[PDB]
From a paper:
Picocyanobacteria strains encode a putative ABC-type phosphite/phosphate/phosphonate transporter, phnDCE, thought to provide access to an alternative phosphorus pool. To understand the function of the PhnDCE transport system and its ecological consequences, we characterised the [name] binding proteins from four distinct marine Synechococcus isolates (CC9311, CC9605, [name], and WH8102). We show the Synechococcus [name] proteins selectively bind phosphorus compounds with a stronger affinity for phosphite than for phosphate or methyl phosphonate.
Therefore, to understand the molecular mechanism of Pi selectivity, we determined a high-resolution crystal structure (2.0 Å) of Synechococcus [name]_[name] with bound Pi, resulting in a closed ligand-bound complex. The extended hinge region in cluster-F SBPs is believed to provide greater flexibility between the ligand-bound (closed) and unbound (open) conformations of cluster-F SBPs. This hinge region encompasses a buried ligand-binding cavity and includes a Pi molecule within the [name]_[name] structure copurified with the protein. The [name]_[name] structure displays an unusual asymmetric distribution of electrostatic surface potential, where the front is completely enveloped by positive charge, attracting several Cl- anions from the crystallisation buffer. Within the crystal structure of [name]_[name], the four Pi oxygens are bound by a total of 10 direct hydrogen bonds, forming an extensive H-bond network to the main chain and sidechains of residues distributed between the two domains. These include a tyrosine (Y44) at the beginning of α2; an -STS- motif (S124, T125, S126) in a loop region joining β6 and α4; a histidine (H156) at the beginning of α6; an H-acceptor aspartic acid (D203) and a capping tyrosine residue (Y204) found just before β10. A single water molecule buried deep within the cavity also contributes to this hydrogen bond network. This water molecule is further stabilised by intramolecular hydrogen bonds to residues on domain 1 (T65) and domain 2 (S123), contributing to the interactions that connect the two domains and occluding the binding pocket from the solvent. Similarly, the capping Y204 sidechain is engaged in hydrogen bonds to residues D11 (domain 1) and N174 (domain 2), contributing to the two-domain interactions.
Residue numbers in the entry: -2 to 272
The structure:
Amino acid sequence: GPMQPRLKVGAIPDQNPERLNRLYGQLADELSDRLNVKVRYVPVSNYPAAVSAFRTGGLDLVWFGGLTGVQARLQTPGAQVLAQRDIDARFRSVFIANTSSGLQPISSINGLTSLRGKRFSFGSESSTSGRLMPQHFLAKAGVTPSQFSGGRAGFSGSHDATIAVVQSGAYEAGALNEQVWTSAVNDGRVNTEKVSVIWRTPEYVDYHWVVRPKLDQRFGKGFTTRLQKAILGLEPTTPRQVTILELFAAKRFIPVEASQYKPIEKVGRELGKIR
Ligand SMILES: [Cl-]
Ligand SMILES: [Cl-]
Ligand SMILES: [Cl-]
Ligand SMILES: [Cl-]
Ligand SMILES: [Cl-]
Ligand SMILES: [Cl-]
Ligand SMILES: [Cl-]
Ligand SMILES: [Cl-]
Ligand SMILES: [Cl-]
Ligand SMILES: [Cl-]
């Protein structure tokens, strides 16, 4: 570059953009200070745009879901996974229902048959915790979205929006990210008189950082390792890092296990979401 290099950081748009701008904008400044390079957060409008901008070089480092990060790595030779939160090793979805819907707590996966004929919303089409794994667990109970009221599921686009369309009564039930649910309950952003959890899924792996190949050619030998150490180094010490980690709802970032994403890829191929 005739210019000094700049690291472009992105994230799937999985909740309110104003909240994500506070998190990733502060994280860009924190990485900038830790690395002594220019770092900018570049937002995207939907989940596929995160995959595509990563693939084409519009984003260098992205906070992906399970499904989107698998897609981004399959489409981008030499992309690496760098880290995940502590909680991403053992992630869950919550199935929620409007408390007027008559839907009862479910004690087994077989109980998901109760959602046949109901208005049900997934999150993003490409969401792991809001679509893929929920659709997987539904299919094991013998429920397909064809069986919901209207012959299909809603897609709200985000974990926040799934809470909002169940809370409003526009849908009777939905599925979303358990961390976003728990944070919204704790923060007062969900009316727990109107919405309750009917089921928590089995554990699966979900969010992780994926980095583009060849960043060492742009920023110098060792940079990608320094970037991975910067993420794994995040600690609740300064106000800035306390805020970053509270918005992630993590105590720390941890390394991933080699091919811990093979079960998410397998589900993605089973449900036709991976080419
Ligand atoms: Cl920049
Ligand atoms: Cl740039
Ligand atoms: Cl990945
Ligand atoms: Cl793909
Ligand atoms: Cl779809
Ligand atoms: Cl279907
Ligand atoms: Cl559908
Ligand atoms: Cl519908
Ligand atoms: Cl390189
Ligand atoms: Cl560091």
